Design a protein around this ligand. Structure first.
Ligand SMILES: *[C@@H]1O[C@H](CO)[C@@H](O[C@@H]2O[C@H](CO)[C@@H](O)[C@H](O)[C@H]2NC(C)=O)[C@H](O)[C@H]1NC(C)=O
Ligand SMILES: *[C@@H]1O[C@H](CO)[C@@H](O[C@@H]2O[C@H](CO)[C@@H](O)[C@H](O)[C@H]2NC(C)=O)[C@H](O)[C@H]1NC(C)=O
Ligand SMILES: *[C@@H]1O[C@H](CO)[C@@H](O)[C@H](O)[C@H]1NC(C)=O
Ligand SMILES: *[C@@H]1O[C@H](CO)[C@@H](O)[C@H](O)[C@H]1NC(C)=O
Ligand SMILES: OCCN1C[C@H](O)[C@@H](O)[C@H](O)[C@H]1CO
Length: 863
């Protein structure tokens, strides 16, 4: 046996022969570090009984267990395999108990499959019977993608395991963790998944959300595939250098989806087609967000707001953390320390800004006739709390306000209760969006105020290697009861159900609007309802570096609006770290500076009205705002098609194996390469320049570099930003709010490829109405240059912006001098525009031009 293919048979304790012999496994302690001493024997597990049965969707098989004896509880001796050829590029199979129904994730988006197996499959499926294995191979080249034969199927009531071989070590995904790198190098590694309030640090623990999806790039041709496990029980994913991946969960069923694509982007698209594509954000939520834990008082918050406005910082959103509340209680504000809160929200709104308020799931149970607490009284009347195991007494835990009950957002009535709470509170404070925190769900006591009973749910046969080693640690009892089921099965779905309910509440509080929801805890599909932030990081250079894989991974997961706390939540931030972080932060899809309680100010203007940090921050935030039309269009593509927004180099440059492990750089979509300085003291970064034409964003000049590692010179006020030849970038002259910026003239940056061609697009709608896409109320146009001609072509034209918008500048990069430029509108000339040419940089700027948005034009020149 090859040692890299040994599947660990003692995942639960240090390995010993006595245990090994007792489990019927193989013993060989001679291997290298982490190679399993005790591993499963070749014939251990299930076999197919009888024949496979063709069905309309695919096939079923009956699986039978070769009689072993209990290790992690009751074995399931008769297992049903059901396989559905759902689409040409999506395969679904589940392993269930033949004789008993079991817990299955009640996903809000994924539906059951009905009717017939798809035509023109890109994959073929093979079943072996003695012993059972399942294999999925790519038809075009016979590449084995999924292959469970490396290990057994284990299917006990509270221990389910399946492994698959992998065709490469280019493996990306799984969460929520701090992986540190982007590519899983497949050395021996276990990643637990169980939603938990814990620090995203170098310890590799389970964090706030649960994401089983991974993507595998098979080879340099781009051919890629994805695997998703639809399971919400505590689990761990085990990676080894075979290469192989094992899923090990403590409940539910093994419900697997396999996705094939021609490129990594197609895998992501196929995955999001199944679980749900991300919500199109409000355009304002694409601006800069400022926040902190404990301004303490409204005067303090107002002071920070005011110094940043005085600095002319682009700055759309102010968040209000739990300090705004009356003693940290939802749906109240502090009438002393936040006296005049409603007038402040008026001032924000008058200045074109928005207010997002934090809300916690926990509701104080402290209500008397003397002092009534409305949210608690109303929720108690509606009977919408999580109950203890008796099924009828609301479970009591403890969070910020003291003893608390927790809403059962899996109950449709709880969304009606929650909605009414927000409508009532909105009458007092006119917030614009909602930040849902602590929704793992996070509890200051273990399980409940009376702890947790000793039983198979709170104290299961096997516990994955989760932080602290017990399931109910800093959360609800596992035998707590909700409408969807027991906490043991649905713990990982709490924040997901909270996002669903909060979206539902927004249909009433902000009629017809997207608003903005930011969530901490997620499950697969949470991006349909919410943005995400990476949690309570620290102001260290390690945290800055670790943020890039975190953002990339959440883009795989369909949560493209994701970012960390810029400058670092915990700790006072050093000026140099915060300056570098603000430079990079300008380019996170979610861009928020947030700071923990008690630490020194880290809002940009706190560093000084004429500090290098403030000047640089404003500079790069203005570039971010200039490029918002391009970013917004990327979000349109994420929402409508399922493309990523922050994109790894490898998704565009997979033919080049030097991109496969790049994680210190990333792209906005296909065209914009972002290269931060990420090292303390550094004024350079070692960077990779992919195989394309690149132009410096600011000067427009073509770099000499191509398909090579470079030492990019980046002084204290610089981040690397390059535009890819072949792409046209729509821009809008910036201002300090998107309310104002959206009224400004537009521009095009044409970055020419080797053949002097480029293409691009622009999506434009009202920026706020929900379902402008489903209802087809938008503008979509396409730009294409070849090679003495720009064509502006209109493809969807059901929104005309009443602000009279037009392109009034075209920048062309990598071009010989354009002469005698003409503008035709629907073939009719024409107005003669101004052209400025830099012969040294090879940049032309066309100005004194007025291409109305939503109209077709041709712009021609000669050389
Ligand atoms: C938690 O316990 C409460 C009672 O404290 C249950 O409330 C029931 O609510 C339904 C639906 O509104 C009513 O028709 C019942 O009459 C209520 N029962 C009682 C005994 O008051 C609630 O169902 C429980 N929730 C869960 C998840 O089990
Ligand atoms: C940026 O937006 C501001 C609004 O905050 C504008 O400052 C306003 O616009 C017009 C000038 O055309 C004035 O009548 C307003 O009084 C201006 N200021 C204020 C304080 O309201 C500004 O024009 C915008 N500028 C850009 C670059 O688009
Ligand atoms: C792991 O956690 C401990 C606290 O449990 C902390 O002190 C330590 O710094 C963490 N390690 C890393 C590598 O971040
Ligand atoms: C409940 O709130 C009241 C009103 O402020 C307070 O006096 C009392 O101590 C609280 N009870 C608990 C259980 O802390
Ligand atoms: O347990 C503390 C609760 N919250 C944790 C969040 O992750 C953080 O962003 C927020 O500032 C803080 C106060 O609301």
């Amino acid at each position: 046996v090859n040692e890299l293919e040994r599947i660990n048979c003692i995942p639960d304790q240090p390995p010993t022969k006595a245990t090994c012999d007792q489990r019927g496994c193989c013993w060989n302690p001679q291997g290298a570090v982490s190679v399993p001493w005790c591993y499963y024997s070749k014939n251990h597990s299930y076999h197919v009984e009888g024949n496979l049965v063709n069905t309309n969707a695919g096939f079923t098989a009956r699986l039978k267990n070769l009689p072993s004896s209990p290790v992690f509880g009751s074995n399931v001796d008769n297992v049903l395999l059901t396989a559905e050829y759902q689409t040409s590029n999506r395969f679904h199979f589940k392993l269930t108990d033949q004789t008993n129904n079991r817990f299955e994730v009640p996903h809000e988006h994924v539906q059951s499959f009905s009717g017939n197996a798809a035509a023109s499959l890109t994959y073929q499926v093979e079943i072996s019977r003695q012993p059972f294995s399942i294999k999925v191979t790519r038809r075009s080249n016979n590449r084995v993608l999924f292959d469970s034969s490396i290990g057994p199927l284990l299917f006990a009531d509270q221990f389910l395991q399946l492994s698959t071989r992998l065709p490469s070590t280019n493996v990306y995904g799984l969460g929520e963790h701090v992986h540190q790198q982007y590519r899983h190098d497949m050395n021996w590694k276990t990643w637990p998944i169980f939603n938990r309030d814990t620090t995203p640090n170098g310890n590799g623990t389970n964090l706030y959300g649960a994401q089983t999806f991974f993507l595998c790039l098979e080879d340099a041709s781009g051919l890629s595939f994805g695997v998703f496990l639809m399971n919400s029980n505590a689990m761990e994913v085990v990676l080894q250098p075979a290469p192989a991946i094992t899923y090990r969960t403590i409940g539910g069923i093994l419900d697997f989806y396999v996705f094939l694509g021609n490129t990594p982007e197609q895998v992501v698209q196929e995955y999001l087609e199944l679980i749900g594509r991300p919500a199109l954000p409000s355009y304002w939520a694409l601006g800069f967000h400022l926040s902190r834990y404990e301004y303490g008082t409204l005067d303090n918050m107002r002071e920070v707001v005011e110094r940043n406005r005085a600095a002319q910082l682009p700055y759309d959103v102010q968040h209000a953390d739990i300090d705004y509340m009356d003693e940290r209680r939802d749906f109240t504000y502090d009438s002393v320390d936040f006296k005049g809160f409603p007038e402040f929200v008026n001032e924000l709104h008058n200045n074109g800004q928005k207010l997002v308020i934090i809300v916690d799931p926990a509701i104080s149970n402290n209500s008397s006739s003397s002092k009534p607490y409305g949210p608690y009284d109303r929720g108690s009347d509606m009977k919408i709390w999580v109950n203890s195991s008796d099924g009828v007494t609301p479970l009591i835990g403890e969070v910020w306000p003291g003893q608390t009950v927790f809403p059962d957002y899996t109950n449709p009535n709880c969304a009606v209760w929650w909605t009414k709470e927000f409508e009532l509170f909105h009458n007092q404070v006119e917030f614009d969006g909602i930040w849902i925190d602590m929704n793992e769900v996070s509890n200051f006591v273990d399980g409940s105020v009376s702890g947790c009973s000793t039983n198979n749910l709170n104290n299961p046969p096997f516990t994955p290697r989760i932080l602290d080693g017990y399931l109910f640690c800093k959360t609800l009892c596992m035998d707590a009861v909700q409408h969807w089921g027991k906490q043991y099965d649905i713990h990982n779905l709490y924040g997901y159900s909270m996002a669903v309910a909060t979206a539902e509440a927004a249909k009433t509080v902000f009629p017809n609007k997207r608003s903005f929801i930011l969530t901490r805890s997620t499950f697969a599909g949470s991006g349909k309802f919410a943005a995400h932030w990476l949690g309570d990081n620290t102001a260290t250079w390690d945290d800055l570096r670790w943020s890039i894989p975190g953002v990339l991974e959440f883009n795989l997961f369909g949560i493209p609006m994701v970012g960390p706390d810029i400058c670092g939540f915990a700790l006072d931030t050093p000026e140099e770290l915060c300056r570098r972080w603000m430079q990079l932060g300008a380019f996170y899809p979610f861009s928020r500076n947030h700071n923990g309680q008690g630490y020194k100010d880290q809002d940009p203007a706190s560093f000084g009205a004429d500090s290098l940090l403030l000047n640089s921050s404003r500079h790069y935030l203005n570039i971010r705002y200039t490029l918002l039309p391009y970013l917004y269009t990327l979000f349109f593509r994420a929402h409508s098609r399922g493309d990523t927004v922050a994109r790894p180099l490898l998704h565009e440059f997979y033919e080049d194996n030097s991109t496969w492990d790049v994680h210190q750089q990333f792209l906005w979509g296909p065209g914009l390469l972002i290269t931060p300085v990420l090292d303390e003291g550094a004024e350079k970064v070692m960077a990779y320049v992919p195989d394309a034409v690149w132009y410096d964003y600011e000067t427009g000049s073509q770099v000499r570099w191509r398909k090579q590692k470079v030492e990019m010179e980046l002084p204290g006020d610089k981040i690397g930003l390059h535009l890819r030849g072949g792409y046209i970038f729509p821009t809008q002259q910036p201002n300090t709010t998107t309310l104002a910026s959206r009224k400004n003239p537009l521009g095009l940056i044409i970055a020419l490829d080797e053949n002097k061609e480029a293409k691009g697009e622009l999506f434009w709608d009202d920026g706020e109405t929900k379902d402008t896409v489903a209802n087809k109320v938008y503008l979509l146009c396409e730009f294409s240059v070849t090679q003495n001609r720009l064509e502006v072509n209109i493809s969807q034209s059901t929104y005309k912006d009443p602000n009279n918008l037009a392109f009034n500048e075209i920048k062309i990069l990598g071009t010989e001098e354009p002469s005698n430029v003409t503008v035709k509108h629907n073939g009719v000339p024409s107005t003669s525009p101004t052209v400025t040419y830099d012969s040294n940089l090879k940049v032309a700027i066309i100005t004194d031009i007025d291409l109305l948005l939503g109209e077709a034009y041709t712009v021609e020149w000669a050389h």
